Point group: D3
Chain length 282, copies 6
């Protein structure tokens, strides 16, 4: 059985940018088939409604087992409209968001939606005087490295893979939808890192990434004097750059012990595992 | 007046992952509106055809001024199907691809399509023993950093911005469609870097990135002994990691002179420019 | 005129460890004379009282113009005893402390005491399973670097030097006692860095250092499971190590422009100033 | 029983700055109680005499088991006055010093004093054109890192801990007083590093650090042309900065093997030990 | 049997600069004796002929068992003259060269000569506007690091050592002359590195060094506009600097496992082996 | 007119390895012609005598204007034989050596020989248990980087270029022979570095390199216990590695100001000069 899903991306988060690709990293899965629609970076009410309608139009013929909506702030107006449209729809749905999503966590459960809220997926320093396209991409490169090398992406991969198995068992109840809040302490329940200093450097990285959000928010929404806000948002980027260097450092530690966890998919969708570089994944 | 475009993403490249977002980095442009559809990482003929149909269905009501198709190897069968459907449609279309696209360069011009072929946008080490989702993300982070900090993304940004201005003049002829091949030497025609050592480090980073392709191709398509191919594809990732560090080091040299070029958009879509950290973009 | 002061150190903060030495960096000032007493790291009520008594006994003959008490948490019982004794004494006094001192800020003004509260002077990961003396010193080396290279110690140096000048004018009123809260944003009112990226790297370093406190507090005072709390306090130390790296990077940027601010004392106490390596301070 | 000691600090050395704190790193020992007194950075004959008298005055009621004098150059006139008063007093005494203390080593033994001379504890570049308070703190930060991560502070900690045990057996003869000269070669007699490269990197860092003294002495006491002496003292600081990195690199090696030695104190003053991050100290 | 050889150096390559020294690293071999002659950097026909004549004149009395000619491009005119003179001589001869030597590989075997062609031994950016003596030496230092720490110099050491043993067996047939082409993949057949990431980092270093050649060749022999060729050849040097860092990072990995391969000579010429730092080589 | 010289190399020093090549970096000088002879690493009396005889034999027909002998310790037996033979010959001669040559400095002037003694050209840790050919080459790469990037090679380049101009004026008196001792302080008389921190970093590097010699000597000639000498000589190599990193960091500083000094030769042997990357040397 081939599981089917539609991903909807409005605005951009590290996680929502990579979510579908984490699930079929070499395109050889024969057990999944995805459609991705979005309105690029725009996430106001009209755009989000238009994106969700695309999904729903496509769903009629595609018949997806579930739908995923990914982007910043589930509590904002645009994403709120999406939650509402998807809740009222026939399809099980999952919301991917960031720390601000916590404000509507209870609401989402009441709505019958799953969620994955990624606290370290921090808003960037979105002031015109600082953030051009190249800076926006550099920040995203640092963030992606943080979310990957600390193991956060593995947590997201797992959550969807478990859900895809349920989709293949043919009934997805609300009880099956993920309800995850991911942060620095998430790593304490996992066996991601063989070396405990690699773990605590990855924790520091997630801590700093999460702390980036408050700096950005202060610079974008609170401080009004550009003489103050430009430096403030630029300092949030210098942070994320260092979180990435910490995440890098953790990974090299795992390399030094020939212990880098890799969990690739087999063509039948099964998730394999290995540590040693020369060891076949199984 | 508002330019409209649909982006189609099948498979993944650093440039195709970011192309739409480079054009509206804070989501405040009032002069553009985009739709994005894709079949995620899958880019065989059926998936590509299904992706392009999504785009065309949506186009009926959306009425885009142009359509972009982005992903690996324009010469491959899936991307070949797309070029033909788009070349045969009523919509001006642009192909975003990598070095292997060079094989059908003349074909694409004959087809009446524009293209942007990014040679440093190198295929990764796609063998299951090595590439799991986290590794695929890590690679993508390094590559994004290279394409951003060396200024390749600015060349991309500029080509689409020029096209969007034409879309607003209301006629896009074949003469308007971009026809770009980007590589290490592209920097020599630009004024990206104020410091000439930042420039040559950035050139070294693009040269190493472009060299990664051959190593990945040897490891995925030529070498058949996994005792040899796993180290080979892994060494391609170590290369892209050091390319990213070179790009970083270049950008830090522009910092040391307070000379980082930023070219953000204004709400009306105009591209602004500045160098000094405290100077308003204009 | 020779100004005199007594410094009392109970417990240890980066700032209280260096406070007196920042005022006479080559021991050639002829206009100051200091005495320094303390009970080492112990800062419970009996020790703090004993420390302040030494100070007051010595003060009888020494006749200091002002007395400074420095160490962790002005709101804690030990430090609260010292504030009380110092407020009730005849000598103007200044409290050096960390973020937790903010809880008794209004109290201190009401007590007629000056203060300097250094938010980035963060508590370390004080769990026996992690913190031995070597780890404790490593943390203090990283923190000293942060507080020095970001310019925080320069803010402290100025505050006392202004006070010392008042002491020489012979009357210190409450109006003269410093009332400072130092943190990341402190750098925004200063001209410490010629290079604006050195400034924002230094702001990032201060932000991470202030963020370290919360991680330490969670690991020492909230989390009770040592399988959780050891990694937690260790991740706080990894953060401070990276903050030190940022502060270092900022300072190397100033070096690259031969713009490193130095403000040494002349023998008569006057504070000189220079930027260029070869330029005499004046 | 509770061992009591008074520390006297005149001038500054990395070792004298940290000596007392290395003995009670979390302030939970119930077996010791300390007083600290000093005249800050000033160490001429009259300051030192005043410092020592402070200690003697307090000692009448405090009744310490031993007194420690710490600061630069035991052979200098002020330190020499300290040795005279301490040698003549009733209290066992230890002298904490640097390499210049070697000139009065035999004298010290003849005086009945113990000593710990730390050759890597190098004089900084005390010229007004270069050394302001910030630069003095920066140096102290790199020095502290060197003395901590190479192990040197652990040799100190151990020596005082042994002495403290003899203080508790209630008689301290001259035979118990430490007589240590510490340098690069000290590591060869120890088991500080599990990894042999961490050791040799640590050795190199102590060698560079000891070499710093000669460059500082040349720049401060021999070269008289400021066009020569400013760059000379500045180069001594760049040395110490790289020594600090060597020491960091050594400790990261220990991390990679999960083999970082920690020897914390228990509440009763016993010195515990461990190597594995998760292992309880014992 | 003491084996005798003459080395001829015309032009410079990393390998030819170090070839003889790799065979007697502490000068304590009693089983070899060498003469070295050359014309420094000049390698045109006249100079090469003069160099080979020196060698042959000396050979009359010296009676070497074999002769080595080392330097750039065995296919160039100067080196072609040497191959002809050596082939026609009575002495077994080996040619050390770089990738361009591949054009005359078959020719050399037909000539009855041995060869070792080192692909990563890349031509530098020889344009007067960029390459002064200091730059030439810096590039050589990076290249030497690469060739050493990746294990390429060990391969060269072995080939000669095997030949030297044959020379002592008293007959060197053409069958004994080395016929090696060394590149990135050479590492796959060896057991140089205990850690597999050290290996792949070394492979990446060798790939980059090999890629340097093409960039230098483009900038020296193809591009004619100095506004383009100066940055081009400077970018080749930035590449080689990063290859050296990768090689360094590989070796530090081996240190982290106490597994650095060392194969020194014994006085009797026997090649010893060890991994652990404290283990006698055997 | 074309100046001619013979270089004799016995043993190895960073300077002697590069001395001839620093004089014709692209091989395009038409005003010089060189022969190079040596006995490789061996420098005992018989070998040195045999090397000097080769030179003198060749000199009969070559008619060199001067002869250079380069290698370790001009005071050792081998090199003493060379000095005597060269002093007694008809050819003006120059001795290239290291610090130990200082012992026979006066003797060399009495002998009528010139010299260049390079104190930072430090002996490596030549113990069999540590130094194999790869380690030997790694040390030489680090030292070469130090001697090049700090500007020491430029000093040597100048000295020979001045002598070469005299050789073309046709008479070389003893008054023309260089008599140089190079060390850290040599940089103070030069204008090598535009940035003063690059200068003091290069000084630090030369100080560390020069300090390496003492560590090597202790480990090779003094310490007899291999448990002590192996770590000792390996620590000298860690020092040289850090000295190379300081030299690198100095050069990157020069890059950040577009101020790297380049002094290439024109075809007629004239020494050109430039600082800006794009500026023609003149
Ligand atoms: C494309 C980007 N990619 C990402 N990628 C990741 N991973 N995470 C992200 O957060 C983002 N971004 C988050 N994004 C994001 C977040 C917040 C805001 C809101 C703005 O931060 C507020 O609206 C500021 O107030 C704008 O300030 C505005 O006002 C200032 C003065 O102008 P004036 O001259 O008009 O007065 C200017 O700086 C201007 O930008 C915009 C974009 C981007 C859409 C989006
Ligand atoms: C999602 C990834 N993101 C990217 N992102 C960027 N920026 N750039 C990229 O190139 C990619 N990837 C390119 N991708 C990509 C590219 C080429 C191949 C072709 C494969 O390399 C060939 O199919 C291999 O031959 C498969 O190898 C297979 O053969 C081995 C033996 O197993 P057996 O059990 O079959 O025997 C295993 O390694 C398995 O991996 C696959 C995926 C991914 C779809 C995609
Ligand atoms: C000497 C240090 N140097 C510094 N230097 C600087 N710059 N800044 C600092 O904050 C410090 N330190 C702050 N310091 C500091 C701060 C808080 C605590 C309190 C502790 O964090 C809590 O009281 C923990 O609960 C103790 O943990 C205790 O409980 C655990 C289980 O044992 P159980 O088995 O008895 O149950 C063990 O980890 C044990 O340590 C101690 C020391 C040090 C006194 C002091
Ligand atoms: C507070 C510092 N912290 C440390 N911390 C550690 N860990 N280690 C140390 O060595 C120190 N320092 C060692 N200390 C220290 C050591 C020696 C000198 C002696 C000075 O080096 C000589 O007395 C100079 O000659 C002064 O030079 C003087 O002469 C120059 C010309 O001016 P002009 O206008 O008078 O002619 C000026 O540069 C001036 O400083 C000073 C301070 C500092 C007190 C002290
Ligand atoms: C000394 C170096 N050491 C090495 N060491 C190693 N390890 N590897 C190497 O390749 C070398 N080098 C390679 N070598 C090498 C290689 C090629 C060329 C040929 C040059 O690349 C071309 O001949 C340029 O065309 C010269 O261009 C000339 O033209 C421009 C002025 O034009 P115009 O304005 O005069 O007309 C200037 O750039 C000038 O250099 C020279 C030397 C060096 C001799 C040699
Ligand atoms: C090849 C190297 N390249 C360089 N390159 C540069 N730039 N600079 C240099 O100085 C050198 N080296 C200096 N050279 C050099 C210098 C001194 C010694 C003297 C040796 O350091 C002593 O001869 C040791 O005492 C030997 O130790 C011997 O004893 C131990 C075994 O015990 P046993 O049981 O054999 O008795 C072994 O370590 C063995 O090597 C050797 C070589 C090398 C030939 C040469
Ligand atoms: Na603006
Ligand atoms: Na003094
Ligand atoms: Na350069």
């Amino acid at each position: 059985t081939v599981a089917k899903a539609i991903f909807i991306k409005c605005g951009n988060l590290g996680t929502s940018m990579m979510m579908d690709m984490l699930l079929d990293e070499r395109a050889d899965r024969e057990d999944v088939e995805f459609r991705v629609v979005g309105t690029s970076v725009k996430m106001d009410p009209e755009c989000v409604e238009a994106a969700v309608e695309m999904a729903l139009d496509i769903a009629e013929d595609f018949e997806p087992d579930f739908i995923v909506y990914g982007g910043p702030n589930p509590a904002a107006p645009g994403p709120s409209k999406a939650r509402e449209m998807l809740a009222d729809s026939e399809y099980p749905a999952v919301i991917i968001g960031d720390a601000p999503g916590l404000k509507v966590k209870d609401e989402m459960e009441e709505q019958g939606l799953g969620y994955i809220l990624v606290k370290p997926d921090a808003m960037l320093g979105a002031r015109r005087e600082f953030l051009d396209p190249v800076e926006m991409a550099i920040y995203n490169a640092d963030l992606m490295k943080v979310l990957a090398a600390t193991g956060v992406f593995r947590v997201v991969q797992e959550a969807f893979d478990e859900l895809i198995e349920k989709a293949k068992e043919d009934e997805i109840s609300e009880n099956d939808l993920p309800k995850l809040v991911i942060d620095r302490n998430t790593l304490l329940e996992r066996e991601e890192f063989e070396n405990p200093y690699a773990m605590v450097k990855a924790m520091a990285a997630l801590e700093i990434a999460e702390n980036v959000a408050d700096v950005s928010v202060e610079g974008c929404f609170v401080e009004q004097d550009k003489e103050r806000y430009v430096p403030i948002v630029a300092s949030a980027h210098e942070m994320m750059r260092k979180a990435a260097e910490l995440a890098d450092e953790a990974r090299e530690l795992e390399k030094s012990n020939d212990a880098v966890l890799r969990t690739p998919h087999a063509p039948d969708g099964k998730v394999l595992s290995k540590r040693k570089f020369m060891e076949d994944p199984e």
